[PDB]
Subunit: 674 residues, 2 copies
């Protein structure tokens, strides 16, 4: 019955994906939906291209995507998205070459043997797996050569893509213009000022010693939580007064508000004047607090500004005081990336929080594994049928009952998986990470480990429970069925939902028609947001992890991986061409993390291949040990070969970049939060 | 080992030690011995002993040693020897506290138990060890408490020591004079000029852009291997001609050289005229070659000199080109430390050589595992008797087997572990290491791997098998474990007692008495050698030789952590080893040895990493043992291992970053005094 289960799930996913595709064709063909299907190119208003109206058969939206050079993507969005695209491209290339060799040689090899049905059918695809292969068979040699070739191919593609990303980084850095993050460093962990002088007088006359005639200013970090809170309160008050003024300018007859707190407690009489007195009182209070904070709440973190890229880039890898405890220095993140909150955290606090968060993550795997499986089994009562509701017995088809009992576990799992990334991002920022990009990358790494351990081990154990030498052997083929479902579920809808973009489109065209969106305020009406690498990269790493897991056992997941990453390349190329706009520009710094994962997945599932063929019990599984040690060798040689360039900007892309006498004053007041 | 061999080895070591001490204290009172027992304070003339006719002979030097502060050693020998001394002192403190708690509360527990008689031979040393503890005994709880306490004590002393060494390094760097290694970097792994243009024209006009008005000159590392050969040969000719003319002046008889048979017995040629014509020809050839190679024989390594310490120190941690394959930059070593041949090794070549050397190190790990098995076979000759009865005729009388047991295995171990360090230092120098200090510390690390694996594992396991392999006729899985483990481990513990005793007694007697370099002296003078004064190179003492001292010391440290619990008689031997080492090496450093390089304490983090590696590995050993003793302490040592890893990471994160570089305070606020910057140059010239 499992055969029918994933057959039906695949059919439903394909059908609904087709539905959303047709909707996309229907919706995007209208000019009224341009802001939701072309948020980009409206900002920096490149006039979203329509040309002729319709012919409806050819040339819909493909020529725009497939004819986009990496230079075009970098110019239009940035060099960061092109890194994600080269990640997708190298994964696609690995899987394409792997399929082109594996499948024509392993499909017939698996077809001929009949070990399954001899150890005494469940499903036909079970014949096309490394389970219909007899014990002590010569086909073990072909299988081992296959995994060996997989390792060789992925090594080659990783090296090529990593050279390419290093070249793209060196190209983007060298041609950049004057940016405020090129003249600053982020000094943390300073001692208390000696006797009476405040922190500002201490930071100065210290850097003014080390760096005479090449030091400009210092923006000491101050606890401003009160200043923040009152500031967004005042900004929201100004926004409300502005929308009220626009309403007045429209109707010229001040309407009546729903008098009260959320329309419950109060008298809204000429609310314009209420908000006016509120905002001016808030301005006075904010002025007083802003004056107060700059003199008393002066903490132990400070951005430091130099006068030349040479000095700033050189005074960011150097060690300033002969104790790693004090005056720790790193390159200042760009203003859009500084987390003023997570500064001020001393080194010991950073270490202790790092290990407490990692331990809490491990406890998260544990309290996921046992308790959430327990409560999911509890939800099975709601899943099948409940006596208490008086639902009319009209359904009467068991097939969709099976569909529901397949979805509900997956639905709950996905709900908690979507609860994850916010929690992991919040935890990542709790180690005191001083930049948004590093926080997002650490969250992605934590989610990757969680996903691998959790999903892989849990589904493997579930397969073992369903069905010691045959323990690792027989169990894995059945687990492929579950992944064939879940991969497929995330396969169609997620790419379908993003491409169709109906979920933002449902929110749009309704926030405008209803009481919301009185004034134009179109910018935040349809602001797209980032690519949110907190959810793209770890999900694609999970798909890659599964594909390299069953890369050899059941070489039918390879075609699913290829089609997944091909559709991802296509849809995300279209999106980055027309939809998203980045909020931070990390110049491809992300990608070494992706390289380390990819290699970690390859290492882990070379180990899995070793163990699984050891379950096949032939004295040649030791041949995997050279592959494991080779993965270690490749990791170290890559680390020393490229990783240096991805942490800093070398003193050529900073020195001879030919600045044009920067004012150094608009570089300042660019890190000012106020 | 049985009682006779252990006792006779201890007695022989003690008697030779006291003989050497008596010889030293008697023979140090002779003025002629000054440049032997006081090489230092003769160089840098200081009137070695102040006064007349030093009394208190056994303490004439001991009193002069216990009253010397770390500041005195730093001012007299250097800031590197003081690091070795804090290493010795902290190991001594760890083992002192460990003894003060372990011994009184652990030894009686082993003494009162009677796991012995389970044999259905040994020593009383085995009775005062783990083997005497029965199965599932409450005393193993005390033993677990003991290992937990020793781990805590080591953590405490390591942290305190590492703060102290960081303080010493800061105090030394902050007050050092104008030394040429502070203004320079070692620019290595360059590309080639893609035109008609010499390499030096390319190193310039490139750094002149990155560091304008703060870039002074740049030596390109010209390959001079054959130039070096001709220069050393010329200097040998100079020395030999000086010897000949000194002989002629001292005897007024025309010297005659019979060149042939390695220049000893051959064709008779007139000495000084031959040497003069040959030396002038050699000078002409040398200067022609130097002119021909200082230009146009360029390669892809260089040394760069800035003008201010701030720029020089800042532009050494930085990254120069946006590809780490090009313009690799590291802080320049001292001119005395640079290995000019190891430059001109591109990054891939360096990695390939590193990996080949590591693999060869593993192969020779096995090839030394073999004679370690031989040693562990020899040490238990009685059990070796029942196997291979070919040794029955030779092992008949008490005395012969006694002397073999007492001497031979220790001598074999010494021979192997003393031939090894030269090989390891040569191997490390082939990894493209660009300095002498890094090569020495890498050789020390490889020696630590050899020590741990071969010595510890091989000796203990070979003794285990050869004490049990012939008694595994029956195969009860539960039963063979206990017999194997208990009847095995304390035997290796006793052998290591003997070995460590041999080391501290004989080695420190030889070092303190210094007779071997003294027999070379007083004989290289009275015989044909040492005709001219030339005293300086006749008794030049040399370094502390950290390539051979720290390795052996860490081997003894690992052994003491071996049987700090299993057989807590090792603890006394380790304490006395390190105490005698402290005392003797103090006397040496204050008076005898003078270093050739100054690393400003960069070597101690490696020492800390080893020490913690030993602690980790033998928390693991205790975990395996208590758990092969059949009780559930298994979960009581995993927390110790986890906290060991956390301690390692925390120490690396808090202090290690301060050892690799000199901060930009000791560089700026060092208050320069108008450095010449020209005599700073031509101090890195290879000649």
């Amino acid at each position: 019955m499992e055969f029918g289960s994933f057959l039906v799930s695949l059919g439903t996913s394909f059908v609904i994906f087709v539905i959303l595709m047709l909707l996309f064709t229907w919706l995007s063909r209208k000019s009224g939906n341009a802001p939701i299907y072309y948020p980009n190119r409206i900002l920096k208003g490149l006039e979203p291209w329509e040309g002729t109206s319709l012919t409806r058969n050819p040339f819909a939206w493909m020529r725009e995507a497939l004819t986009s050079s990496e230079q075009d993507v970098v110019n239009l969005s940035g060099v960061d998205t092109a890194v994600h695209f080269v990640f997708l491209s190298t994964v696609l290339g690995i899987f394409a070459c792997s399929s082109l060799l594996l499948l024509p040689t392993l499909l017939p090899l698996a077809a001929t043997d009949n070990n399954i049905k001899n150890t005494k059918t469940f499903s036909q695809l079970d014949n096309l797996s490394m389970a219909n292969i007899t014990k002590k068979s010569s086909r073990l040699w072909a299988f081992l050569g296959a995994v060996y070739w997989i390792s060789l191919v992925t090594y080659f593609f990783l090296w090529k893509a990593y050279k390419h990303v290093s070249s793209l980084r060196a190209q983007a850095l060298m041609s950049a213009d004057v940016k405020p993050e090129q003249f600053a460093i982020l000094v943390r962990d300073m001692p208390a000022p000696p006797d009476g002088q405040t922190q500002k007088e201490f930071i100065d006359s210290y850097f003014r010693e080390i760096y005479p005639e090449t030091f400009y200013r210092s923006l000491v970090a101050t606890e401003n939580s009160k200043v923040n809170k009152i500031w967004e309160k005042l900004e929201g008050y100004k926004k409300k007064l502005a929308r009220a003024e626009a309403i007045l300018a429209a109707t010229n007859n001040r309407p009546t508000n729903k008098t009260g707190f959320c329309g419950l407690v109060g008298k809204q009489v000429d609310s314009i004047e209420y908000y006016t007195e509120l905002i001016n009182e808030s301005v006075a209070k904010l002025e007083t607090e802003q004056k107060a904070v700059l003199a008393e709440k002066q903490q132990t973190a400070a951005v430091v500004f130099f006068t030349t890229r040479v000095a700033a880039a050189s005074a960011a890898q150097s060690l300033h005081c002969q104790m790693v405890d004090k005056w720790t220095v790193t390159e200042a993140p760009e203003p859009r990336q500084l987390l003023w909150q997570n500064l001020n955290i001393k080194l010991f606090s950073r270490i202790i929080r790092q290990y407490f968060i990692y331990f809490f993550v491990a406890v998260t795997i544990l309290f996921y594994m046992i308790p959430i499986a327990f409560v999911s089994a509890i939800t099975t009562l709601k899943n099948l049928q409940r006596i208490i509701p008086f639902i009319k017995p009209v359904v009467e088809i068991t097939a969709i009952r099976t569909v529901l009992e397949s979805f509900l576990p997956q639905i709950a799992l996905i709900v908690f998986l979507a609860m994850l990334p916010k929690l992991l991002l919040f935890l990542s920022k709790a180690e005191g990470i001083p930049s948004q990009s590093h926080a997002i990358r650490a969250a992605s790494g934590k989610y990757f480990y969680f996903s691998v351990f959790n999903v892989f081990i849990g589904v493997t154990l579930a397969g073992t429970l369903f069905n010691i030498i045959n323990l690792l052997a027989t169990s894995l083929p059945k687990s492929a069925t579950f992944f064939l479902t879940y991969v497929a579920l995330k396969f169609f809808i997620g790419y379908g939902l993003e491409l169709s973009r109906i979920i933002p489109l449902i929110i749009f065209h309704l926030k405008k028609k209803y009481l919301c969106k009185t004034e134009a305020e179109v910018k935040e009406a349809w602001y797209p947001g980032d690519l949110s690498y907190a959810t793209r990269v770890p999900g694609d790493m999970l798909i890659l992890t599964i594909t390299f897991c069953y890369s050899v056992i059941a070489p039918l997941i390879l075609i699913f991986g290829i089609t997944y990453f091909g559709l991802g390349w296509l849809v995300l190329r279209n999106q980055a061409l027309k939809v998203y706009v980045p909020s931070y520009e990390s110049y491809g710094e992300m990608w070494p993390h992706i390289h380390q994962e990819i290699l970690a997945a390859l290492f882990l599932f070379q180990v899995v291949m070793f163990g699984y063929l050891g379950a096949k019990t032939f004295f040649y599984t030791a041949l995997v040990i050279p592959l494991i040690i080779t993965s270690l060798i490749f990791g170290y040689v890559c680390r020393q070969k490229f990783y240096g360039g991805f942490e800093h900007t070398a003193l050529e892309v900073a020195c001879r970049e030919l600045k044009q006498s920067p004012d150094l004053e608009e570089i300042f007041r660019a890190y000012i939060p106020h």
